[PDB]
Amino acid sequence: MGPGFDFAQAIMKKNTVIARTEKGEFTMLGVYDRVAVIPTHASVGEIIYINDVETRVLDACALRDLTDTNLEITIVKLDRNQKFRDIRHFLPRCEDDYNDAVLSVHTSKFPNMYIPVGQVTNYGFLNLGGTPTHRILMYNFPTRAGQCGGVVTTTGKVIGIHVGGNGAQGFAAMLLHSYFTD
Numbered sequence: 001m002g003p004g005f006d007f008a009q010a011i012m013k014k015n016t017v018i019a020r021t022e023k024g025e026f027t028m029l030g031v032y033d034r035v036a037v038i039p040t041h042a043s044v045g046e047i048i049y050i051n052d053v054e055t056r057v058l059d060a061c062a063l064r065d066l067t068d069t070n071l072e073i074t075i076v077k078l079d080r081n082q083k084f085r086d087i088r089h090f091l092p093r094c095e096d097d098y099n100d101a102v103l104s105v106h107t108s109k110f111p112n113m114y115i116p117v118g119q120v121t122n123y124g125f126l127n128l129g130g131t132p133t134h135r136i137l138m139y140n141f142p143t144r145a146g147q148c149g150g151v152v153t154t155t156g157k158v159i160g161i162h163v164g165g166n167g168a169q170g171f172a173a174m175l176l177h178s179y180f181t182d
């Protein structure tokens, strides 16, 4: 409907796949080469389905900060025959607050879904399903089951992936440029 949705759509059309694990179907953001991200609660194994195709996982790393606190981001390298468009230049370098964000989801349950979530707070610490978690972003939208792995963007930045909610607020794990230096 406007330039926020324009940037979100451009990321969804080229940089997402549908990932299926034993824990469900997730929006999965491709970042560069064969490297993608997914919420750590997806429990990625040796094999994952990518757009309903059996795919070997070459590497998977559940990120934690230097205090050994969960960040809820798993970086996956996929044995896929095709690279993602490199979007690392759209990742923030530092923890920050944002205005006017969009959460975008693409699964069998929610195809081509875009939600204007508004203001995003650097929330920091969250007890996420009983797990102490750092670098959480918060937005005042009642997100539901099905949206995990959804991409959070502003105009010109990819800032996080949706990892949970409490019925009134939604929560995303930050994406930082320093996670994807090669």
Ligand SMILES: COC(=O)[C@@H]1CC[C@H](C)N1C(C)=O
Residues within 6 Å of the ligand: 006, 007, 010, 011, 155, 156
């Ligand atoms: C992921 O967005 C893109 O590919 C570029 C980045 C700059 C501009 C917003 N844009 C659009 C809407 O085509």
